Design a protein around this ligand. Structure first.
Ligand SMILES: CCCCCCCCCCCCCCCCCC(=O)OC[C@H](COP(=O)([O-])OCC(O)COP(=O)([O-])OC[C@@H](COC(=O)CCCCCCCCCCCCCCCCC)OC(=O)CCCCCCCCCCCCCCCCC)OC(=O)CCCCCCCCCCCCCCCCC
Ligand SMILES: CCCCCCCCCCCCCCCCCC(=O)OC[C@H](COP(=O)([O-])OCC(O)COP(=O)([O-])OC[C@@H](COC(=O)CCCCCCCCCCCCCCCCC)OC(=O)CCCCCCCCCCCCCCCCC)OC(=O)CCCCCCCCCCCCCCCCC
Ligand SMILES: CCCCCCCCCCCCCCCCCC(=O)OC[C@H](COP(=O)([O-])OCC(O)COP(=O)([O-])OC[C@@H](COC(=O)CCCCCCCCCCCCCCCCC)OC(=O)CCCCCCCCCCCCCCCCC)OC(=O)CCCCCCCCCCCCCCCCC
Ligand SMILES: CCCCCCCCCCCCCCCCCC(=O)OC[C@H](COP(=O)(O)OCCN)OC(=O)CCCCCCCCCCCCCCCCC
Ligand SMILES: CCCCCCCCCCCCCCCCCC(=O)OC[C@H](COP(=O)(O)OCCN)OC(=O)CCCCCCCCCCCCCCCCC
Ligand SMILES: CCCCCCCCCCCCCCCCCC(=O)OC[C@H](COP(=O)(O)OCCN)OC(=O)CCCCCCCCCCCCCCCCC
Ligand SMILES: CCCCCCCCCCCCO[C@@H]1O[C@H](CO)[C@@H](O[C@H]2O[C@H](CO)[C@@H](O)[C@H](O)[C@H]2O)[C@H](O)[C@H]1O
Ligand SMILES: CCCCCCCCCCCCO[C@@H]1O[C@H](CO)[C@@H](O[C@H]2O[C@H](CO)[C@@H](O)[C@H](O)[C@H]2O)[C@H](O)[C@H]1O
Ligand SMILES: Nc1nc2c(ncn2[C@@H]2O[C@H](COP(=O)(O)OP(=O)(O)OP(=O)(O)O)[C@@H](O)[C@H]2O)c(=O)[nH]1
Lengths: 344, 459, 140, 54, 51, 98, 320
């Protein structure tokens, strides 16, 4: 890409979600969603290889179908109420269709199959964008209509997302697929508390982003797209092992780290609302994630996998890739539990 | 309490800023001084427990465990000075940091006033322990041992978190003093039974209970010497302490919900004392002896009497010292012959006359020789269980006989017989190792002299 | 309508066996139908006849599990007067798990299904008795 | 009991169950045809849920 | 965790580019002539065209 | 009005079904997406005309603008798929299973 | 201001710098053919930069102090050991070949960076395009295994397609008997052990796979020894070579920019040579790897980043 194209596509990517978050009109929220969908595809298919094209096509077809369902809901609400916004009197089926289509856009189970494949097929920075920035626009619409959503539908989607993410992450040797399934699990947690307290959904989104962006940056540091590839960190870049371990454990949700606070506060609010069974099931199944993160920690930081002869030439060279943002975000994602009351 | 906590934190910058030659000396000396400072908790001249702030407190149950935790860290640092002899200086400092961070977290846990803070710290202690076991073990099974140790705890801990959230929603607070003073009876509903189970399961697994103890022999066999030391000494007592604290709000359900676990502990103590008779690994033998001993603590805490609580506390402290001493003794031979098989080394008293004296003292404490605090705790637990039911004495006597048998069998196999002459590498005992054993034994003798310190809340 | 399912809680447990067994068989059949639908969709059969055979297998297995669960629960609660005790549901769940294991020809699956399904059924009975609600509405 | 049955009953059984579920769930063919058929099934299920719940 | 079905899978390429089979190009064949206005009536120009 | 809107809703549902159930051609799925767009445009236009809500008549045209942009992007992806594989069969697009 | 999109926008465009002699010229030939002299003369006469053939120590000489390092750091391979015992059992043969390919890839990155940054052409002796002849000779003579050949082919497939080929290739053809005679005349106690079959395999590879392939995209010039002597004739051929072929014609500023960004980060260049393929000949093992890595990081001028080693005279650390 040349500078004009880079500017004009990154501006569209940034503008889509901004328009959705700022719009009062459901049609303009849909316009923002379309902006995101159209602007991201060239960056997905930028490298031009069969996997890139396949990922781009899958993403496009899925997201276009979801956008059409959302537009159907918007148009039916317009027909019913003569207004371009969901009201308290909007029809339950219209709201259910909107919820299902937006969950398809997000990637919540069982509408999750496309997400790990599209994540696998694209470069790491594009995966970072897709799993962080592209989640804001669909979630904003839901957060605007949180008094109207169906708790039964949302909790079924949430528990299904937790179970499917936890089970998917176990079987994966691919780092991008593991990131995708982590995204599915955390989105299940985010959606579990939407009908009750969307402030906690925003908190979980923020902590998830602050954890995921550094993980993708660390992956990009050496293009470690596999467990065996990341295992060579002790030789290629030893200094990142401690922060990678802590970030993975925080994603898992071990208490002392910041990643605990979302699960803890969400369980608290669900219990306050008398959602004991679902809260217990979610907190119980969120341990498979700790397992398949601890496997990564074993392979990367707590052991030493075999290395190659050529990695000495790697050692010879000088590197300048880690930004100032990695340290900031990693520290904020791991060592911020003491400041818990401020976050909520 | 901050006067104990903060210097413990400052140990870490001391470790990372000290020169490579003086790091061990400085850290060990200042850990000893912090252990001395922690003795200010013993100045209780009234029945009003110490409450330093809204966040920390100290009772007769917490103070012994806090002092033991403060005391152990110098001993762990000393024990770790040989098998970390070859590692890089950064790696040695990382190990020291893990041990110091474990000390800080355990002291905070035992001084905690709220159950939720207790939970956060009691589960934060896992990360340093997993790191120590997996990153510094010697065998390929350390990874699976760490997985077991982590998930046995996590599975039981999640229900504990759910129960604590439920209690806070119902009552409005988790402060232990408020809960104790405003405690009310629990209706015997099925939901309340499930609450009882959720409150007790995490601690029972940590103890461990007889059915869910498989994670402990693995961890002890695969862990380094400091890992085994801290584990057996304090990480098992976390469960007993939590049970004692949280049982105050679960009455009267205990009276009928304790039967399954009282029975499990009473039978499993025999079933593990028996395994100790035919365990080939010395570390495994010590671990199973620990399981059998902790069965007594579980049973006494379950039956809940003034005698049972005091006996449980005394046995907690005595086992904390004695099991650590036994692990250090075993590691002394391991660092020389590089095998945990007990039959491999024999007649070692012919070449280590004084190490054999330490072996004998540790074994006598293990089998509970009067007037040792081991026997104080065991005898008072036995009396409380006898009052409970007069047929518990049968199981207690069987366990006593088996304990004597396996304790003396360890000595007869290792320190006695004909020397395994083919072992040319049996170097003379290190002054460091002898000092380690002496520091394990002297506090035991002094506490035997003055047992009033290690009685619990009840007496 | 769907009130056919909520009719399960009319007469106290231990009475109207045939009816409760019909309800539970319907529930099991519906679950098996959904599972077969997903299995045929993702992981397609090699032939249409094979797909229909797999749908039949799943539906019959699930219906048998549900029928056994209901029948065993009612028979237990009738043979022993205990009309509202979670142990009846635990026994029924174990019977359903044993049915699953038998139909699959697997002892390990039989035992694990017995334990898990018994626990799930006992928890369902406890929830019905104590007033828990799956999927509570936002009350805050 | 300690080396065989207490291993089979709790840790080994749990590990086997979840290793079976993971393989059952993550053997997807990678075909958008099948993925969208599953999405259609989900939509039908949601419609039925709403219809019978009123 | 291998499965009977996953047995036939293989790890993805280290760089996402796959070694894909050569693609046959089937350029259209046209019989320009002989009965064509511009073929001079007795020329069979066989053209392979891409578009 | 009522019967017309019911028929339009059913037509959109048919187009959505045609989109969800593939049939070995990406172009056909793109055409089904176009059909869904057409149904929605007709519904919005009919609703605006029936309500006399002249200020909401811009929205139908914006729907077409964005649907056309989406269709162009889809056709570009079809071009890329045909370049890669020789046809627009969705069977080929399965490299990401592993 | 390191090169980036900002620098490209503000200027620093490759097409602006390119001139008539902004080319890449690769001299090839069997062992002992005059490549060194021919390349030196071509570079001196055309103003281009001479790049001596990448060896076992190219990376160490190009980074850090510039001094050669211990072989434990520089690849644990030995050409003398290869010639003494070609069919070793520690895989010195394939370890040497893979290390040499990695060094040649690094040198090609350096040469491309120099050309694109300054516009001055580069004269290289052999390159990543002709490296495979030695591997093929090894496999034909039985010095390595099919698995080693597959691993080499995979790394080449991962790395080579990302860079532009040389503009001109200059092959000095000298027959195997004369190669052998020249080797004996030089008198290297280890090199003299090379069998004639190995040299014939190298020549066969050069004449079967290399030259026909490179003729597709580059400008090829084949010379005999009597023409390779008197390098002025070769330079006179190059000076009138017309380049109307290859991938260099379809490049533009915003393709040179991304090629430069790739070639500017030496870590990214060698990223794929270190793929975790567990070939015994190349796998190190954790204990030796950590030992060697710590010993290396304890070398002078290697503990920290280049500008931050007070031991080697770096200054103003506290404000850097
Ligand atoms: C909750 C609702 C409220 C919202 C709050 C916000 C919530 C957070 C949103 C979600 C966060 C995700 C954000 C993703 C940002 C970008 C991700 C990405 O793909 O880049 C990875 C990027 C990799 O950078 P790099 O390793 O330096 O790449 C080397 C460059 O090529 C080095 O060479 P280069 O020159 O080519 O660099 C790229 C170049 C390219 O610039 C452009 O293309 C755009 C403008 C071109 C103008 C001409 O940029 C420029 O130099 C400027 C051009 C003038 O990593 C990041 O910097 C992301 C930072 C993490 C942000 C997370 C913050 C969470 C809080
Ligand atoms: C905790 C999680 C541990 C995961 C395991 C990480 C690991 O194994 O490291 C690689 C280890 C291999 O060590 P290595 O091969 O000798 O070289 C690694 C060094 O980076 C060799 O590089 P170096 O020797 O040039 O640099 C060593 C570095 C020392 O840096 C380190 O490697 C240690 C950093 C972790 C310290 C943990 C503090 C514990 C906090 C308690 C709460 O600097 C110092 O020696 C003193 C600087 C002061 C300490 C740095 C603390 C700053 C960050 C604090 C963040 C705390 C987050 C918690 O395995
Ligand atoms: C009423 C209640 C009465 C309670 C009595 C309970 C009766 C239980 C009977 C247990 C039988 C134990 C036994 O048979 O002897 C094992 C043991 C074997 O000695 P060994 O055969 O001569 O071994 C020689 C070494 O291999 C090679 O070294 P060596 O032959 O050259 O001799 C050096 C000498 C070295 O002697 C020392 O270094 C003494 C240093 C004591 C330091 C204490 C610091 C306290 C700090 C306060 C602050 O002895 C030792 O090495 C023993 C080191 C351990 C001494 C620690 C004090 C244990 C007191 C036990 C209570 O002997 C004892 O240490 C037992 C001590 C006497 C038992 C208590 C009798 C009451 C006396 C109170 C005064
Ligand atoms: C409490 C926390 C427990 C934690 C676990 C242990 C680890 C901490 C290690 C701390 C190291 C310092 C030890 C501090 C505890 C010592 C207790 C003690 O010895 O008390 C003083 C002892 C009692 O004497 P006395 O005054 O007569 O008691 C009367 C009671 N009615 O007076 C003495 O007689 C002392 C000298 C007796 C020597 C006897 C030797 C026999 C052989
Ligand atoms: C509203 C009413 C909701 C009722 C819920 C009914 C629940 C029915 C039970 C769940 C069915 C799961 C089907 C299944 O088992 O997976 C099949 C397929 C694996 O294929 P296969 O090897 O043939 O399965 C062997 C089974 N012994 O594996 C798959 O295809 C993966 C399926 C994942 C998506 C399942 C989503 C179910 C939950 C939907 C929530 C909405
Ligand atoms: C409800 C049934 C819908 C129609 C079923 C058509 C047959 C079928 O199995 O659906 C799959 C079909 C894809 O067709 P194809 O991939 O070529 O395989 C044909 C195998 N008999 O899928 C399709 O062809 C698209 C079907 C869309 C149906 C829209 C109208 C339904 C009217 C009733
Ligand atoms: C009462 C509730 C509390 C109890 C909760 C119990 C949960 C514990 C789950 C811990 C999971 C342990 O997961 C463990 O994974 C290791 C991998 O190292 C497997 O390891 C083993 O797998 C199989 C045997 O089954 C062998 O082929 C393999 O060589 C061996 O390593 C164990 O079989 C499995 O048990
Ligand atoms: C009650 C809810 C609690 C859920 C969470 C509790 C933690 C459970 C962890 C489940 C995952 C355990 O993951 C465990 O991985 C190990 C290897 O690491 C697998 O071990 C495997 O070893 C080899 C292959 O390597 C196979 O021959 C063997 O049959 C298999 O067991 C176990 O089969 C799997 O069970
Ligand atoms: N196995 C192997 N040996 C190589 C490789 N490159 C060089 N060598 C060896 O290194 C030596 C290089 O021989 P030379 O011909 O003298 O190289 P040069 O000096 O730069 O060029 P000349 O002037 O022609 O001699 C030979 O023994 C050969 C390689 O890629 N693989």
């Amino acid at each position: 890409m040349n500078p004009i194209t880079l500017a004009i596509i990154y501006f569209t990517i940034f503008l889509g979600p901004v328009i959705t978050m700022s719009s009062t009109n459901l049609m303009l929220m849909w316009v923002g969603l379309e902006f995101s969908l159209l602007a991201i595809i060239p960056m997905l298919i930028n490298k031009k290889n069969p996997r890139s094209t396949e990922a781009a096509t899958k993403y496009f077809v899925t997201q276009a179908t979801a956008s059409m369902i959302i537009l159907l809901a918007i148009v039916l609400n317009y027909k019913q109420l003569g207004t371009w916004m969901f009201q308290q009197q909007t029809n339950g089926l219209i709201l259910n269709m909107t919820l299902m289509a937006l969950s398809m856009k997000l990637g919540l189970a069982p509408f999750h199959f496309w997400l790990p494949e599209v994540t696998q097929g694209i470069p790491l920075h594009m995966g970072l964008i897709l799993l962080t920035w592209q989640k804001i626009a669909p979630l904003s619409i839901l957060i605007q209509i949180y008094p109207l959503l169906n708790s039964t539908i949302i909790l079924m989607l949430a528990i299904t997302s937790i179970f499917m993410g936890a089970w998917g992450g176990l079987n994966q040797t691919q780092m991008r697929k593991i990131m995708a399934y982590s995204s599915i699990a955390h989105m299940g947690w985010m959606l579990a508390i939407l009908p009750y307290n969307p402030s906690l959904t925003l908190l979980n989104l923020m902590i998830y982003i602050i954890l995921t962006a550094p993980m993708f940056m660390a992956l990009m540091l050496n293009n470690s797209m596999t467990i065996n590839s990341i295992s060579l960190l002790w030789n290629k870049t030893p200094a990142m092992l401690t922060m990678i371990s802590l970030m993975l454990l925080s994603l898992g949700g071990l208490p002392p780290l910041t990643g605990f606070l979302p699960k803890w506060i969400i369980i608290t609010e669900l219990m306050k609302n008398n959602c004991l069974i679902m809260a217990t099931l979610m907190a119980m199944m969120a341990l498979l994630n700790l397992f398949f993160y601890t496997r990564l920690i074993y392979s990367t930081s707590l052991t030493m996998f075999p290395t190659n002869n050529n990695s000495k030439m790697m050692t010879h060279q000088t590197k300048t890739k880690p930004n100032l943002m990695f340290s900031t975000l990693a520290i904020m994602s791991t060592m911020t539990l003491p400041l818990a009351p401020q976050l909520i | 309490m901050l006067k104990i906590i903060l210097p413990s934190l400052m140990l870490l910058p001391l470790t990372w800023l000290s020169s490579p030659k003086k790091t061990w000396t400085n850290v060990t000396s200042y850990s000893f001084l912090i252990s001395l400072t922690s003795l200010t908790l013993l100045w209780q001249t009234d029945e009003n427990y110490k409450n330093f702030s809204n966040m920390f407190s100290s009772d007769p149950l917490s103070t012994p465990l806090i002092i033991l935790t403060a005391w152990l860290l110098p001993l762990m640092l000393m024990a770790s000075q040989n098998h970390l002899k070859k590692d890089n200086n950064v790696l040695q400092k990382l190990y020291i940091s893990m041990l110091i961070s474990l000390q800080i977290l355990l002291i905070m846990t035992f001084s905690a006033t709220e159950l939720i803070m207790f939970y956060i710290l009691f589960e934060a202690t896992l990360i340093p322990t997993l790191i120590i076991i997996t990153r510094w073990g010697n065998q390929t099974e350390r990874l699976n041992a760490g997985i077991y140790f982590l998930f046995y705890t996590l599975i039981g801990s999640i229900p504990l978190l759910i129960a604590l959230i439920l209690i806070q929603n119902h009552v409005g607070t988790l402060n232990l003093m408020i809960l104790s003073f405003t405690t009310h009876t629990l209706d015997a509903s099925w939901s309340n039974n499930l609450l009882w189970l959720a409150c007790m399961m995490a601690f029972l697994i940590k103890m461990p209970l007889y059915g869910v103890h498989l994670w402990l022999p693995k961890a002890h066999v695969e862990a380094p010497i400091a890992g085994s030391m801290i584990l057996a000494a304090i990480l098992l007592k976390l469960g007993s302490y939590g049970m004692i604290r949280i049982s105050i709000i679960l009455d009267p359900l205990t009276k009928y919900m304790a039967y399954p676990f009282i029975l499990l502990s009473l039978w499993g103590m025999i079933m593990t004392s028996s395994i100790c008779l035919r365990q080939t690994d010395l570390k495994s033998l010590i671990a199973y002896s620990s399981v059998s001993h902790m069965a007594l603590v579980i049973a006494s805490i379950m039956i809940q009497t003034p005698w049972s609580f005091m006996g449980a506390t005394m046995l907690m402290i005595a086992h904390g010292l004695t099991s650590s001493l036994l692990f250090c003794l075993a590691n002394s031979n391991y660092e020389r012959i590089h095998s945990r098989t007990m039959i491999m080394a024999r007649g070692l008293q012919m070449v280590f006359p004084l190490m054999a004296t330490w072996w004998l003292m540790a074994s006598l404490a293990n089998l509970a020789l009067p007037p040792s605090i081991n026997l104080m705790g065991e005898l008072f637990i036995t009396m409380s269980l006898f009052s409970w039911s007069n047929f518990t004495i049968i199981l207690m006597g069987i366990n006593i006989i088996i304990t004597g048998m396996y304790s003396m069998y360890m000595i007869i196999t290792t320190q006695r017989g004909k020397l395994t002459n083919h072992m040319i590498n049996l170097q003379p005992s290190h002054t460091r190792e002898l000092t380690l054993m002496a520091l394990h034994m002297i506090p035991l003798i002094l506490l035997t002299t003055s047992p009033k310190l290690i009685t619990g809340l009840t007496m | 309508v769907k009130r056919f399912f909520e009719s399960y809680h009319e007469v106290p447990d231990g009475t109207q066996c045939h009816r409760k067994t019909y309800i539970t068989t319907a529930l099991g059949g519906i679950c098996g139908i959904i599972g077969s639908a997903y299995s045929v969709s993702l992981n397609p059969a090699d032939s249409t006849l094979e797909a229909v055979a797999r749908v039949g297998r799943y539906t019959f297995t699930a219906a048998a599990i549900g029928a056994m669960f209901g029948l065993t629960t009612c028979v237990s609660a009738q043979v022993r007067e205990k009309p509202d005790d979670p142990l009846n549901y635990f026994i029924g769940g174990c019977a359903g798990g044993l049915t699953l294991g038998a139909r699959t020809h697997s002892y390990g699956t039989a035992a694990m299904g017995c334990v898990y399904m018994g626990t799930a059924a006992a928890l369902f009975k406890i929830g019905k008795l104590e007033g828990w609600e799956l999927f509570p509405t936002p009350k805050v | 009991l300690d080396l065989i049955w207490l291993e089979k009953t709790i840790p080994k059984s749990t590990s086997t169950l979840h290793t079976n579920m993971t393989t059952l769930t993550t053997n997807q063919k990678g075909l958008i045809k099948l993925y969208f058929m599953s999405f259609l099934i989900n939509i039908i299920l949601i419609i039925i849920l709403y219809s019978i719940n009123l | 965790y291998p499965s009977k079905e996953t047995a036939h899978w293989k790890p993805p390429p280290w760089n996402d580019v796959d070694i894909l089979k050569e693609k046959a190009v089937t350029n259209m064949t046209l019989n320009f002539g002989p009965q064509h206005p511009a073929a001079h009536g007795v020329l069979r120009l066989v053209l392979e065209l891409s578009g | 009005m009522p019967s017309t809107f019911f028929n339009l809703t059913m037509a959109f549902s048919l187009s959505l079904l045609g989109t969800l159930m593939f049939r070995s051609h990406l172009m056909s799925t793109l055409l089904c997406l176009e059909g869904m767009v057409l149904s929605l445009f007709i519904m919005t236009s009919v609703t605006s005309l029936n309500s006399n809500s002249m200020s909401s008549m811009p929205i139908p045209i914006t729907i077409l603008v964005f649907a056309a942009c989406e269709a162009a992007v889809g056709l570009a992806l079809l071009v890329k798929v045909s370049n890669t594989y020789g046809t627009d069969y969705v069977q080929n697009l399965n490299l990401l299973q592993c | 201001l390191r090169y980036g999109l900002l620098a490209a926008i503000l200027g620093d465009k490759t097409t602006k710098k390119l001139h008539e002699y902004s080319r890449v010229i690769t001299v090839d030939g069997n062992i002992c053919s005059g490549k060194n002299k021919l390349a030196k003369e071509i570079a001196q006469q055309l103003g281009m930069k001479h790049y001596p053939e990448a060896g076992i120590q190219y990376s160490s000489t190009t980074t850090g102090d510039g001094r050669p390092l211990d072989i434990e750091f520089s690849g644990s391979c030995s050409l003398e050991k290869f010639y003494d015992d070609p069919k070793s059992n520690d895989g010195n043969s394939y370890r040497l070949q893979s290390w040499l390919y990695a060094s040649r890839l690094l040198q090609y990155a350096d040469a491309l960076e120099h050309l694109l940054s300054t516009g001055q052409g580069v004269v290289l002796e052999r390159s990543i395009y002709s490296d495979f002849v030695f591997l093929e000779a090894m496999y034909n003579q039985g010095y390595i295994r099919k698995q080693c050949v597959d691993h080499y082919n995979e790394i080449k497939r991962l790395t080579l397609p990302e860079y532009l080929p040389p503009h001109a290739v200059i092959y000095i053809d000298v027959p195997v008997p004369e190669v052998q005679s020249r080797i004996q005349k030089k008198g290297d106690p280890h090199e003299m052990k090379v069998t004639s079959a190995y040299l014939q395999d190298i020549e066969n590879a050069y004449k079967k796979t290399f030259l026909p392939k490179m003729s597709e995209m580059c400008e090829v010039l084949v010379y005999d020894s009597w023409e390779a002597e008197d390098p002025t004739k070769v330079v006179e051929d190059i000076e009138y070579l017309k380049y109307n072929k290859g991938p260099w014609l379809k490049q533009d500023d915003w393709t040179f920019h991304y090629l430069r960004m790739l070639v500017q980060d030496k870590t990214e260049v060698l990223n794929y040579t270190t793929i975790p393929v567990y070939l015994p000949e190349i796998t190190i093992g954790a204990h030796q790897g950590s030992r060697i890595y710590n010993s290396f990081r304890e070398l002078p001028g290697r503990k920290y980043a280049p500008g931050y080693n007070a031991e080697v005279g770096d200054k103003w650390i506290w404000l850097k």
